Design an enzyme around this catalytic site. Structure first.
Site, PDB file in Angstrom:
ATOM      1  N   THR A   1       0.825  -1.195   0.000  1.00 52.31           N
ATOM      2  CA  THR A   1       0.000   0.000   0.000  1.00 52.31           C
ATOM      3  C   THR A   1       0.867   1.256   0.000  1.00 52.31           C
ATOM      4  OG1 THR A   1      -0.156   0.005   2.415  1.00 52.31           O
ATOM      5  CG2 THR A   1      -1.832  -1.221   1.192  1.00 52.31           C
TER       6      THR A   1
ATOM      7  N   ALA B   1       7.933  -8.281   6.035  1.00 55.01           N
ATOM      8  CA  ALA B   1       7.525  -7.738   7.328  1.00 55.01           C
ATOM      9  C   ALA B   1       8.517  -8.105   8.426  1.00 55.01           C
ATOM     10  CB  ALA B   1       6.121  -8.232   7.680  1.00 55.01           C
TER      11      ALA B   1
END
Lengths: 241, 210, 245, 254, 249, 142, 208, 234, 223
Positions: free
Chosen positions: D72, D120
């Site tokens: 995003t 992540a």
């Protein structure tokens, strides 16, 4: 004696000497026994004196003659612990030579190898020399009967015949006189039993007072094998003149 | 070339309550078509009211649980028997997982317990250490069958906060029964560990295929 | 001279006479230890130790002064306790390795040589210390019964009878007498009785003492090393007490 | 010499526990594994570890796959008295329910922020490690670390492992007295770029165009926040961060 | 740790002298005499054999050693150090030169390698200096014949003629009075025999002295035929019979 | 009893694995300047694409020596390998020659390589470092 | 020792004779052809391929030429040092052992294939040596791309009782067959004869 | 005077055959306060008197837990006590991790003896200077061991070490038959230990601050009582 | 190793009310050649534990050496080695499983599957499985290889859950094991007719039967 250092390590004194090496030399006479080595036509004989004053000892476990390889025998003058240490290292050296070069180790090459190790001990500060004298006997496939001696200083040399011990001078003089008389650098006999008897006779006339079968140790090297004789064999040799 | 990994096919579920936590799992161990065992627990009490599960390759999960328990033992030795909190355990497990970054454990890990305020807490870990705190987490095969069943009867946004422990246990049992009916790898038993201020309690329920 | 000044502060140093004084000081440390004897009979060995009594708080079965190196090898030592424990551990390791490699119990002379080389290696450098223990060990192998004594210099010999410790002179005299009186040989039970007698006689120093004896014989223990039960130990103690008084 | 004797005296070898590293990793001798400032990473003991890792990281269970940070849109710029960092908080649902909202920006310090934009686990782990390094540096030098130094530390660390398998693109944003407000971008390839405006995400061209349309150095705090929120909305609710010399301040949906 | 080092065994005395090197020089001066004479056509290297007992075979131990087919060496001092240094020199001739350039090293470079090895023993923490002195004779294409002496400290010098050992001063004077630029190899051999005659206390025959020459190439010592460009060894050790014959003459 | 060397691959990596060259500013990171390796050599690149024979050649002699020590332990006892290792360690530790890299004569005698030559003998083989003080620090452990 | 530097760089850049040995009643003979080819082109019409490990131990090789030369020279240096150390004439078994262990150490990455003949105080010896470290004994051996024609000639006229002259003739004939029938071989025939108790005789360009 | 020349290190014998550095290490135990250990067929207990630097300081820890079935008490140097306790903890952890097995007390004593002997024959270090009392419960029941830093371990029914420990040892010798039979009653054994350690007090009184107790047994994991937890035993 | 060469097929084991039963055939196969007959694949470790190994035979002999070393080290130097300080099945399995997982993590696995069967000192039955990947599990019935697909469904008929263990006598369990071995000899091409069996009972101890043959084979339905 050593003034400052030279009492612990091997460095030069003001006179240019190595006192630790000389003291290791003096350590070789602790056992107070003698050994003799002679050459035949096709055999080499080493005879060592056995002293067992203690009646509680097992005589069969007292020995200063070692078998190094199939063809090489060794006699040690000095205390038995360093003798056994040297014997094990010599066995390892002979086996490694055979593995690395494809043929059996000669007696003189093994003597040179042990002498080089002794040189290491005489030059390194944190290493001490072994207070023993080594005598290697064999029948080399090129040089014939062979006797080679090495000492704590790293010096090695070959002999027509040799003697070592607290009474080595008398045996050396007797051998020198005999070789002057016979004009031959060996013994002219066709069997090793006669050579053994001659060496026993030489030892008897040099030391004196004779001995029984339990005071002697005999090793014989032929072209194929080095072997130590037993008490019965020595008794037969003593009986047979 | 030798393949060091495998797959054993389990299903685990963690739910955080108001003042309790629940970690449940199916007890069937399989090798891709065959049943190795019908009772092989995968949810373990680790001490200090922390329950742990590592689903996936069974050897990796066993190794991870073993290492965590030994680390907790040394933590008690070196810090005057201090209680290990759930967030500290989560960080320890993150470091344990990321220590194998270039040769990872093939597992999905869930731990459950109570936070410093006494509320239920569940943490989920990715295979290389990424972790987060969640209200409810389903892992393994048939997770896609278990999560919608729970969402159909619970408003995570009766609200989950006011649910009791028995109601949560019944809901977990119902979801696992449905998953066992619809999935060939789920069955043979369900084991539930419940963490409250009184400690860890164990419940077992038989599933289909015996 | 017993004290060599200037040549007795380092381990691997030769004196002008060719002596190593640290090894001799270790020997003197040995000569202050408890009396230990070993006797070789016609088909085995017997070991005897003059144990000194201690507090009643000792667990009676957990303090034994005769160590079992292996099922056929038993040893005793006099000198420093830690050195003796270390040497016994090394002997056990050597015997285990030999049995693993060659699928037979290690012969006694091979064990003696390995132990002697290990002891001798500690007289070579100034960063170590000679072992302050003398060890009497022995057992039975395919060639028969063997008894050896090993000294701090690494020197070891096989013996008909061996003695070490404070009461070594009297024990050695008694062993010489026993050897002289039995030119043919000796049996295991007679050996046990004579070992008890010799341990009792050698004791000369207000302190009560007990006795430990150990057998290893082909006819009596099937070539294995065993301790002495109540009956034989009591009989030997009675014989020794009759000998003393 | 006795250690030499122990080495040649004869179970432990098969367990591989004669190696100190194996003992430390399994917590046999203590908790020293959790005491290393530079963490130790296990590598397969084969000729081609990189090929092994790449082959085994692309093969079945969704829960056993390496979690990838959201692609995003993420925005950062520096107007006159700080840094505006803007992200979209439209989280992606799965087989889980979140106890609270997740955050796409890592809070390294009360004065430092970073963005994930990659793997992540890599971003979380190494930015926590970077926070530890910055704390130790500030304790040693008795002064706040410069943003250039922190970004350089992170870049050197990621470059030491270049090509091993890591993937991470982060934006280090800070404000110090000597430097002013500074933004750097650090990639897993070793890239380290200083900049004024950064836009990294799925759709970032729209946000960059909206910024360039109405970007000036004389923007106010409220104007800068509004511009960042509008740029994020144009790209694709919106979490905002304002970084000043005294630290960062978080705005939920301002 | 206190075993990560060991203090230097050779240190400067307050007068500015390294005591261990001086004591090694004394040990050399207590050794047997050896000499070398450099002529126009070759170099003679000679020494006196010694024996602990007459029963020793003096031919087994040789104080004269071939380093390369064109380089030989002799000694004064301690024998084991000689043996060690000779083995090292023979190895270095191959590792450093022949495996690199395809040819044996010149005399000076081999002397330099030996001297470097000896010098490294005087700056050490655990070896004493070598207590030995070296005479190296050789020949090479671009330098002709050469004779060098190497000291325990590692210093080496070229000599027209020199002697080392117990009788070195008298031998040096005798060589000083008996050397010229037009001497021949046979004259050098005769002078060497005369010089050694003044130092040997016992029997001066062919079984108690040892001589070797660097002269002309000996194709009969190659061991193979067929290559005209393959030069035979120039180092040759004289037999006992040859020494006896020269002594009779 | 190994003939070809085994277990030559690394099992763990870290940014502080080289204790000799560590940054003073950031002790957890290596010092690129003092490494003097070209400045663009990350450690990861050393984990892949090596010649298969390189590890075999680099560890060959150590492997043969270990096999010899194991044989001595099996046949002679603990004392023989202990003594050999003690001799070699004493010789290696007492030698410090910062200006030369050649092995000593005594080391060659102990290794039984007095009259043996290998390609290591023939082929024994900056802005920062390569000085005597770096060798002193590495030798003394300071 | 031998370096592995620029191995990765070279990979990146890439991604973008007749020899015979015969044995006769008092020694050995080794013969070879004299043609050197850099592919299809004849680089040298008179090239020596018989190499000397020691004055009475000779060898001839095939495979990687640089490897053959380097290995022969290294073993010759080792043999010379060993002979000086032992004060004895070198033996063929010692050279065989050194060659075998050196080739086994490098796991076949040194491409040297050798025929080694010699005499020593123990007698006369002929051996074949493979690049991976295996060796074998024989009475007559052939090597190279012309080895099959030479072996046919050897199998035609070999017997236990051979004099020096017959052995030389047989080796020359085998090399001649290799010369005529194989494209890799040609030109002249080099011979070396070693007898028990004599110097080695090296005959360059024996027949032509 | 002659002892002054031969006590430099642990690799030197005196001309009379004495190793003085080890004797000094053994003497270092007397500088620590008294600890008592005892046991019966079911339980084993340790009692320790703790010392403080002054009024404002805390008291030293004398009892350390090694594993759920084994612990020890110290008398002597602090560094060697720390080292040996950590080593025993590591050995117990290794046993549990590798074999799922509880480390035996005899095995722990043997390991301690092996580790202690090494420092008394090699140059560069020093012998340990702490005595240890080790209590444990295993498959052979209850065990008490006394470790002396010369490298010696003895198994006893009861003992005491430290300064003025002779009185406690005499009391334990006199009443052996009493406490050797206290099975299933931990309180009686603990009180017997407290009475035994009361014999070694000199101008001192046991309080809740200077008294520490430890117990292990069949159903009792190794537990340490400090402070008010010992107020009932005073 | 990296690929098995000489291999054994299957080991099957079951729990009954008072102990465990384990069995395996005597064959080492060299590919499709039935090369070695007379390979003992059941190793008794003490008097309370039997270990059955399938897979590579050289690795199996290595594991046997490890077990022998473990037994010898147990007695060094505890005088209670035959007493309560004897090795337990759980200790042996924990050691073996740790070894297997560590060697899997080393990319040098022992290509074997291992079943440990025995009785604990408190009378409990122990039955565990570990393979070359380090995967461990327990069940009232265990099998490796082809047995895991054929012998297990038969044995689970007798012991289907933990409550069936107290109801199962030694005779029934031995009969089930023998029938499963017969089925394996019927339908396994790498199987042997000769097999060995071992019973571990908390009362009678260890009974090790060798040279057992599959009998009563139905071949008459040819046509």
């Amino acid at each position: 004696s050593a003034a400052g250092y030279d009492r612990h390590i091997t460095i030069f004194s003001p006179e240019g000497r190595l006192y630790q090496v000389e003291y290791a030399f003096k350590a070789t006479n602790q056992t107070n026994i003698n050994s003799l080595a002679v050459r035949g036509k096709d055999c080499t004989v080493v005879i060592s004196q056995k002293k067992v004053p203690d009646k509680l000892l097992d005589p069969t476990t007292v020995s200063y003659i070692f078998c190094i390889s199939r063809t090489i025998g060794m006699v040690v003058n000095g205390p038995i612990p360093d003798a056994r240490n040297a014997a094990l290292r010599a066995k390892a050296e002979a086996a490694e030579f055979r593995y690395k070069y494809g043929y059996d180790m000669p007696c003189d090459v093994l003597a040179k190898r042990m002498a080089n190790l002794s040189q290491i001990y005489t030059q390194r500060a944190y290493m001490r020399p072994l207070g023993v004298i080594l005598t290697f006997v064999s029948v080399d496939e090129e040089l014939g009967p062979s006797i080679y001696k090495t000492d704590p200083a790293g010096y090695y040399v070959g002999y027509k015949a040799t003697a070592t011990g607290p009474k080595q001078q008398e045996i050396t003089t007797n051998l020198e006189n005999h070789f002057k008389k016979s004009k031959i650098d060996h013994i002219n006999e066709e069997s090793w039993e006669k050579v053994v008897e001659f060496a026993i006779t030489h030892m008897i006339d040099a030391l004196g007072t004779e001995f029984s079968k339990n005071d002697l140790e005999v090793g014989v090297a032929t072209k194929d094998k080095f072997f130590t004789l037993s008490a019965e064999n020595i008794e037969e040799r003593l009986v047979a003149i | 070339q030798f393949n060091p990994y495998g797959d054993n096919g389990g299903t685990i579920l963690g739910i955080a309550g108001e003042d309790f936590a629940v970690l449940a799992g199916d007890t069937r161990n399989i090798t891709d078509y065959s049943i190795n065992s019908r009772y092989e627990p995968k949810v373990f009490d680790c001490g200090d009211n922390i329950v742990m599960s590592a689903n996936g390759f069974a050897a990796d999960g066993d190794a991870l649980v073993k290492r965590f328990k030994n680390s907790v033992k040394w933590y008690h030795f070196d810090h005057n028997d201090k209680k290990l909190s759930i967030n500290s355990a989560a960080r320890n497990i993150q470091h344990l997982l990321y220590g194998k970054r270039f040769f990872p454990y093939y597992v999905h890990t869930i731990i459950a317990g109570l936070d410093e305020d006494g509320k239920g807490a569940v943490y989920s870990f990715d295979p290389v250490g990424s972790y987060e705190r969640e209200q409810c987490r389903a892992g393994g095969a048939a997770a896609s069958l278990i999560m919608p069943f729970l969402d159909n009867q619970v408003n995570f946004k009766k609200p989950l906060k006011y649910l009791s422990v028995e109601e949560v246990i019944k809901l977990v049992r119902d979801s696992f029964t449905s998953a066992t009916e619809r999935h060939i790898q789920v069955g043979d038993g369900l084991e539930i560990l419940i963490v409250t201020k009184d400690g860890v309690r164990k419940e077992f329920y038989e599933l289909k295929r015996d | 001279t017993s004290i060599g000044t200037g040549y007795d502060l380092s381990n691997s140093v030769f004196s002008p006479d060719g002596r190593n004084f640290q090894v001799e000081y270790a020997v003197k440390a040995v000569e202050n230890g408890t009396t230990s004897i070993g006797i070789k009979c016609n088909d085995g060995v017997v070991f005897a130790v003059e144990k000194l009594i201690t507090s009643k708080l000792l667990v009676p079965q957990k303090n034994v002064k005769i160590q079992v190196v292996d099922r056929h090898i038993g040893c005793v030592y006099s000198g420093l306790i830690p050195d003796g424990r270390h040497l016994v551990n090394r002997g056990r390791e050597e015997a285990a390795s030999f049995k693993k490699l060659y699928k037979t119990p290690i012969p006694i002379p091979a064990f003696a040589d390995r132990l002697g080389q290990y002891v001798q290696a500690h007289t070579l450098y100034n960063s170590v210390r000679p072992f302050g223990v003398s060890t009497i060990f022995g057992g039975v192998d395919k060639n028969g019964a063997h008894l050896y004594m090993l000294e701090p210099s690494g020197s070891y010999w096989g013996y008909k009878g061996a003695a070490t410790g404070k009461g070594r002179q009297s024990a050695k005299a008694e062993l010489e007498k026993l050897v002289d009186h039995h030119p043919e040989g000796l049996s295991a039970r007679e050996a046990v009785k004579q070992a008890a007698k010799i341990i009792y006689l050698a004791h000369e120093d207000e302190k009560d003492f007990e006795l430990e004896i150990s057998w290893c014989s082909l006819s009596e223990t099937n070539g294995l090393h065993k301790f002495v039960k109540g009956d034989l130990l009591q009989e030997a103690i009675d014989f020794a007490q009759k000998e003393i008084n | 010499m006795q250690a030499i004797a122990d080495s040649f005296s004869v179970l432990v070898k098969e367990l591989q526990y004669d190696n100190e590293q194996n003992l430390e990793s399994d917590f046999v001798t203590g908790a020293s594994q959790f005491q290393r400032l530079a963490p130790s990473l296990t590598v397969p003991p084969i000729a081609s570890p990189q090929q092994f890792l790449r082959a085994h990281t692309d093969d079945r269970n969704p829960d056993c796959k390496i979690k990838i940070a959201h692609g995003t849109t993420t925005l950062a710029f520096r107007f006159q008295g700080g840094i505006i960092v803007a992200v979209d908080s439209r989280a992606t649902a799965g087989n889980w329910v979140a106890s609270q909202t997740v955050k796409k920006v890592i809070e390294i310090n009360p004065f430092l922020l970073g963005t994930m934009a990659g793997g992540a686990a890599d971003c979380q782990f190494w930015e926590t490690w970077l926070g530890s390094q910055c704390r130790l540096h500030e304790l040693r030098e008795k002064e706040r670390i410069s943003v250039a130094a922190a970004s350089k530390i992170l870049s050197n660390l990621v470059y030491q492992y270049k090509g091993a398998g890591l993937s991470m693109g982060t934006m280090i944003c800070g404000y110090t007295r000597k430097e002013g407000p500074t933004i750097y971008y650090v990639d897993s390839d070793g890239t380290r770029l200083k900049g004024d405006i950064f836009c990294v995400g799925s759709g970032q061209t729209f946000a960059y165009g909206v910024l360039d349309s109405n970007y000036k150095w004389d923007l106010s705090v409220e104007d800068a926040l509004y511009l960042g929120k509008r740029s994020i909305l144009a790209a694709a609710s919106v979490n905002l961060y304002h970084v000043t010399e005294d630290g960062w301040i978080y705005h939920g949906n301002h | 740790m206190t075993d990560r080092y060991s203090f230097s065994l050779t240190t400067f005395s307050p007068s500015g002298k390294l005591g261990q090197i001086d004591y090694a020089l004394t040990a050399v001066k207590q050794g047997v005499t050896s000499l070398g004479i450099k002529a126009t056509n070759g170099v003679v290297i000679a020494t006196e054999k010694k024996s602990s007992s007459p029963l020793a075979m003096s031919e087994t131990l040789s104080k004269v050693s071939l380093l390369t087919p064109d380089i030989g060496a002799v000694y004064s001092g301690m024998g084991p150090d000689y043996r060690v240094l000779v083995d090292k020199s023979r190895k270095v001739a191959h590792t450093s030169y022949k495996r690199i350039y395809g040819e044996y090293p010149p005399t000076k470079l081999l002397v330099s390698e030996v001297a470097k090895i000896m010098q490294e023993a005087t700056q050490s923490g655990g070896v004493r200096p070598f207590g030995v002195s070296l005479l190296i004779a050789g020949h090479d294409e671009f330098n002709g014949f050469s004779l060098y002496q190497v000291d325990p400290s590692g210093s080496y010098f070229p000599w027209k003629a020199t002697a080392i050992g117990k009788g070195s001063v008298a031998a040096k004077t005798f060589l000083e009075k008996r050397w010229n630029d037009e001497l021949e190899l046979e004259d050098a051999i005769h002078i060497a025999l005369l010089t050694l005659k003044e130092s040997v206390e016992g029997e001066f025959n062919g079984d108690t002295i040892e001589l070797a020459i660097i002269g002309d190439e000996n194709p009969d010592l190659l061991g193979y035929t067929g290559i005209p460009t393959d030069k035979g060894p120039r180092f040759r050790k004289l037999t006992s019979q040859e020494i006896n014959d020269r002594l009779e003459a | 009893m190994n003939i070809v060397p085994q277990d030559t691959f690394k099992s763990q990596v870290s940014t502080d694995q080289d204790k000799s060259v560590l940054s003073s500013a950031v002790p957890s990171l290596p010092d690129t300047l003092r490494q003097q390796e070209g400045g663009a050599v990350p450690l990861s690149t050393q984990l892949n694409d090596r010649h298969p024979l390189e590890s075999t050649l680099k560890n060959w002699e150590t492997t043969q020596r270990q096999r010899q020590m194991e044989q001595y332990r099996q046949i002679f006892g603990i004392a023989e390998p202990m003594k050999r290792t003690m001799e070699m360690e004493i010789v290696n530790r007492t030698d410090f020659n910062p200006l030369s890299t050649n092995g000593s004569i005594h080391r060659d005698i102990l290794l039984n390589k007095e009259c043996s030559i290998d390609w290591e003998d023939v082929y024994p083989g900056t802005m920062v470092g390569d000085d005597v003080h770096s060798k002193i620090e590495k030798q003394l452990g300071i | 020792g031998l370096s592995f530097d620029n191995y990765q760089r070279n990979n990146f850049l890439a991604e973008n004779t007749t020899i015979v040995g015969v044995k006769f009643n008092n020694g050995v003979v080794i013969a070879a052809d004299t043609r050197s080819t850099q592919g299809p082109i004849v680089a040298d019409k008179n090239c020596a391929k018989l190499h000397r490990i020691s004055p009475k131990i000779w060898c001839a090789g095939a495979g990687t030429a640089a490897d053959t030369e380097a290995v022969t020279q290294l073993i010759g240096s080792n043999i010379e040092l060993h002979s000086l150390y032992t004060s004895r004439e070198p033996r063929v078994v010692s050279a065989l052992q050194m060659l075998k262990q050196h080739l086994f150490k490098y796991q076949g990455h040194i491409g040297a294939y050798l025929i080694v003949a010699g005499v020593d105080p123990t007698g006369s010896h002929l051996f074949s040596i493979h690049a991976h470290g295996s060796t074998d004994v024989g009475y007559y051996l052939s090597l190279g791309s012309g080895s099959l024609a030479a072996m046919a000639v050897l199998e035609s006229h070999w017997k236990q009782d051979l004099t020096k002259e017959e052995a030389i003739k047989l080796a020359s004939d085998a090399i001649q067959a290799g010369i005529w029938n194989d494209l890799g071989s040609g030109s002249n025939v080099d011979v070396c004869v070693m007898e028990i108790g004599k110097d080695a005789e090296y005959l360059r360009n024996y027949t032509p | 005077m002659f002892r002054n020349n031969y006590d430099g290190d642990t690799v030197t014998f005196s001309p009379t055959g004495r190793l003085f550095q080890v004797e000094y290490a053994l003497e270092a135990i007397k500088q620590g306060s008294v600890t008592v250990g005892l046991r019966s067929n079911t339980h084993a207990v340790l009692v320790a008197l703790k010392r403080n630097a002054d009024e404002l300081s805390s008291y030293q820890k004398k009892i350390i837990k090694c594993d759920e079935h084994m612990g020890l008490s110290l008398a002597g140097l602090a560094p060697d006590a720390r080292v040996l306790s950590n080593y025993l903890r590591q050995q117990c952890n290794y046993s549990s991790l590798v074999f799922n097995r509880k480390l035996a007390v005899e095995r722990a004593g043997h390991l301690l003896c092996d580790k202690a002997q090494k420092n008394t024959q090699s140059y560069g270090g020093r012998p340990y200077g702490v005595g240890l009392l080790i209590i444990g419960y295993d498959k052979s029941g209850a065990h008490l061991l006394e470790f002396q830093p010369s490298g010696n371990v003895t198994e006893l029914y009861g003992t005491a070490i430290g300064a003025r420990s002779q009185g406690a040892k005499t009391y334990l010798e006199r009443t052996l038959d009493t406490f050797i039979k206290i099975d299933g009653n931990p309180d009686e054994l603990i009180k017997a230990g407290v009475e035994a350690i009361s014999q070694s007090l000199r101008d001192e009184s046991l309080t809740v601050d200077n008294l520490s107790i430890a117990i292990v047994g069949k159903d009792t994991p190794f537990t340490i009582y400090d402070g008010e937890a010992v107020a009932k035993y005073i | 190793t990296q690929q098995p060469i000489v291999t054994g097929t299957s080991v099957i084991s079951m729990k009954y009310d008072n102990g465990v039963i384990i069995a395996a055939d005597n064959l080492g196969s060299y590919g499709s050649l039935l090369r070695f007959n007379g390979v003992e694949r059941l190793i008794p470790v003490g008097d309370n534990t039997v270990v059955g190994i399938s897979g590579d035979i050289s690795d199996m002999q290595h594991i046997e050496r490890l077990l022998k070393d473990l037994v010898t080290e147990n007695a060094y130097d505890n005088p209670l080695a035959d007493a309560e300080e004897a090795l337990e099945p759980s200790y042996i399995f924990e050691y073996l499983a740790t070894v297997m997982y560590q060697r899997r993590s080393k990319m040098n696995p022992l290509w074997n599957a291992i079943i440990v069967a025995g009785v604990q000192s408190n009378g409990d039955q122990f039955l565990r499985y570990v393979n070359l990947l380090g995967v461990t599990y327990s069940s009232p019935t265990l099998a490796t290889g082809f047995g895991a697909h054929m012998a297990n469904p038969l044995l689970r008929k007798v012991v289907d859950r933990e409550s069936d263990i107290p109801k199962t006598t030694v005779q029934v369990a031995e009969e089930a094991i023998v029938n499963a071995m017969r089925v394996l000899y019927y339908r396994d091409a790498r199987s042997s007719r000769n097999f060995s069996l071992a019973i571990i009972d908390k009362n009678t101890g260890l009974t090790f039967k060798k040279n057992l043959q599959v009998e009563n084979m139905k071949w008459d339905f040819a046509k």
